[PDB]
Each structure stands twice: as C-alpha cells, then as structure tokens.
Ligand SMILES: [Cl-]
Ligand SMILES: [Cl-]
Ligand SMILES: [Cl-]
Ligand SMILES: [Cl-]
C-alpha cells in the first residue's frame with residue numbers, strides 16, 4: 001500500500017546533532033556502525049508507534065470515542081519517529097527539506113490523476129516521478 | 142537505544158490530504174480502518190528504509206566508499222517515511238510542528254546534561270520531559 005491507499009524540523013536536528021557531538025553540510029556516507037545504529041533505532045521507534053496504534057484500536061473496538069488527550073501518546077511516538085528520521089537525513093548531510101519538497105511534488109501531482117472505477121489512484125498525463133538523485137547531486141555540487 | 146545512543150513539511154501533508162480527499166483542524170480520532178491502514182503503511186515504509194540501509198551496509202562491508210549519489214535511494218525512502226509519519230499526524234488533526242517543537246525542546250535539553258564515565262547521556266538538573274499531552278490540549282482548546 002501507499003499514501004493513496006522560524007527553523008524547520010530538519011534544522012532542529014542539525015542543532016541537536018551539534019549538541020551531542022554528532023554533522024556534514026553536503027551529502028556524506030556515515031560509518032557502518034552508525035548506519036547500523038540508525039537502522040536499529042528506526043526499527044524500535046516504528047515498533048513503538050505501531051504498539052500505540054494497537055492500543056487505540058483496542059479501545060475503539062471496545063466502543064470508545066477517543067478524546068484529543070487520548071491521542072497524545074501516539075502523537076508523541078510519531079514525533080519521535082520524525083525525530084530519528086530527520087536525524088538520519090541530517091547524519092547523512094542531506095538537506096531533508098530539499099528531498100521532501102521533490103517527494104511532495106511527485107505525490108501531490110499523482111493525487112491529481114483520475115481514479116480507476118474501483119477507486120485506485122492513477123497517475124495524471126506526463127506525471128514525473130520524484131528525482132531524488134537529482135536533488136542529492138545538486139546539494140553535493 | 143535512543144537518539145543519544147515557505148510552508149513546512151507538515152503543511153505540505155495537509156495540502157496532500159486535501160488533494161486525495163482525506164483533514165481536521167483540531168485533534169480528532171480517526172476511524173479504526175484508517176488507523177489500521179496507517180499502521181500498515183508505517184510498517185512497510187520503515188521496512189523499505191531498513192532494506193536500503195542493508196544494501197549500503199553490504200557495499201561498505203565490501204570496502205566501497207559510497208558517493209553522494211549512492212545515498213539517493215536511502216534518502217528517498219527516509220523522505221517517504223517522513224511523508225507517511227507527517228501524514229498520520231495530519232490525519233489526526235494534530236499540528237505536527239507544535240508537537241515536534243516540544244519533543245525537540247526536551248531532547249536538546251537532555252543533550253546538555255553530563256555523560257557517565259562510560260559515555261551514557263545523563264539528564265541535566267531540572268530536566269523537563271516533553272509534555273505532548275499539554276500541547277494536544279492546547280491545540281484542542
Ligand atoms: Cl474514536
Ligand atoms: Cl482529553
Ligand atoms: Cl538522531
Ligand atoms: Cl498509474
């Protein structure tokens with residue numbers, strides 16, 4: 001499935017990494033041990049988000065109408081996930097906003113296509129996929 | 142483990158959801174079926190990120206010095222993950238930037254603590270944890 005089925009937050013992660021001694025201004029591969037760690041951490045944070053969804057689903061199944069406050073733990077974990085995802089991009093010395101803008105361009109464009117009779121989102125004429133490599137090359141040079 | 146071990150992107154997701162017919166201005170619980178979907182999608186996108194890390198790790202292990210371009214698929218998947226994470230928060234009608242700011246405050250503050258002899262990050266005096274519930278209540282009211 002897929003989605004169709006003042007400083008920015010990226011800049012905040014740069015501030016954070018400065019604080020913990022952790023980053024490059026241009027795209028730069030990290031040490032293996034650091035990739036490994038990032039992989040684990042993404043793994044863990046996505047697991048916590050999915051667990052909080054499970055709790056809400058169980059409460060809804062029992063018939064509860066959740067309040068705004070009830071959504072806080074999930075919102076907290078989601079933000080934690082943004083943090084470590086932005087963290088990865090910052091660690092890589094990749095401008096997250098530049099890459100995000102290109103991904104957003106392509107997704108928004110795809111959203112403007114027609115739908116199949118069964119409701120599946122189709123691409124519009126002349127749809128242009130996200131060219132993230134082009135963004136990276138641009139940032140590097 | 143943990144991290145110690147112009148429109149914003151959140152606003153872009155609101156634009157996207159408008160485009161696909163998908164959102165609330167105040168925190169609002171979603172339908173169960175939609176939570177279920179979001180859970181699956183987070184699951185899948187985090188799996189793809191972790192797979193791209195595996196590929197880079199294998200290349201590094203073989204002795205390669207990765208170029209900036211080599212990082213594009215990982216950067217692309219990371220941005221895809223931001224997209225569906227921001228997507229969740231938007232779906233919930235929760236201002237992602239407000240929640241992120243509070244999580245960032247707490248993380249940056251924790252970073253200012255001393256480290257144990259073994260290098261573990263300790264909290265500073267009077268450290269105040271992220272109060273995401275307070276943010277949610279504020280957004281609701
Ligand atoms: Cl509900
Ligand atoms: Cl409440
Ligand atoms: Cl991080
Ligand atoms: Cl198509």
Ligand SMILES: [Cl-]
Pocket residue numbers: 029030201205206207
């Ligand atoms: Cl490398």
Ligand SMILES: [Cl-]
Pocket residue numbers: 208209210211
């Ligand atoms: Cl290259």
Ligand SMILES: [Cl-]
Pocket residue numbers: 003224225228229
């Ligand atoms: Cl989404």
Ligand SMILES: [Cl-]
Pocket residue numbers: 262263264
């Ligand atoms: Cl501590």
